[PDB]
Amino acid sequence: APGASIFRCRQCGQTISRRDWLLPMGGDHEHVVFNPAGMIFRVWCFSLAQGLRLIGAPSGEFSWFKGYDWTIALCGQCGSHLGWHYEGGSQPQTFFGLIKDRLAEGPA
Template identity: 25%
Template sequence: MYGVASKSAFAITTTTTSVPVAVALLLATLSVSSLFRPVLSEADSSEAALQEFIICRQCGTDIADSYYIETHKSPSATIYSNITLFGKRGVDLQVLINPIGIQFKIVNTPKALCSGVGDWVPADSWYPGFAWKFCVCPQCSTHLGWIFEPTLTATADRANPSNKGFYAIIVDNVLSEKLVQSLMVSPDLIQS
């Protein structure tokens, strides 16, 4: 746990967060979300300005851009909600349960920077006709979700999804860039 200081009218107070210092330092110096977004028209730019980059909760590595979140409804979803998440309206959040009973809140995106590990597994897929493999943070190897690929194209030499495949990102294992930035403190606020 790390403390974040804030300056009030009378004193400096400290609140506790679970954001690693590395995340705060990374975001203080670098924002790469614009590298993943296409060039947008003026009409589209106001919507894109509300969206944000999604980072690994453990180490702060850039994982995905909320601009690309899309819907892949799973017939296995126990809960399905259309919400505003990561600065994007209309995000389809699904709750899925794996064969051993663990629940995961996930969102889908066709583009992400997490690394696929292991072999493609066609059994126990939440998406019929798709094989899956684990997806981990390329920096710290935290499990961030899964890659899903149509079974016909899920070959041993395919590391990333094709244009018909996608990533399922575990919401509880990532943070939004703007949330972390809101928790950061300027050195000027700490001085009295």
Template identity: 30%
Template sequence: MSELVTTKKKPTVIESLLDDFEEKLKKRSDNFIKCANCKHVLTHEDTAISVGGTHRHVKTNPFGLTFEFRCYSEALGCAISGPDESAHSWFPGCVWQYLHCEACNQHLGWFFHGSESFYGMRSDAICIE
């Protein structure tokens, strides 16, 4: 009787990509960033990024209003409005536009783009669930 010899087959590119994706999903946080007003999902906690050395910023505009906001690389649940504004940008080389919840239109913060692109969401306008 002959023995069946099996050899380990080298995974295909797609199989390797799927394995990598599954590993990332296992490590991924379960928390979503939501609009504090209507609980619409804006992005995922894993999209949090550091801009200028920190994720959280506190900045004051020319009218004396101070905002605390957090930076994210993606925000698929948001809408961007208004023209590109270069005046009073808190980030050199970036222009900004208003950022709103696409479900309830609540002002969430700003979309910055130029030397880099990111979403600055006001801490008081979002919740993590």
């Protein structure tokens, strides 16, 4: 009966990812970053996610992860901005950078 196993959208409960899918990018699953509007984000990297909607075409501008292009990842249900999808890199080719405090962690 684990209580930490899955991540849901904090705003609506949409199923998004699992603890098992945490990815230590550059040796840490957590990355503390800011965007050009100076917003600070505690980003958890996941190899896999579901229930998102990826919007727009990938951009390399201001990428926090060298060699990766990002798209905005919204909650596919409620439209909450949950993070970004990263692609175009190597090892891994793709992953998700999700904003920790926008997810709720709990049992399956």
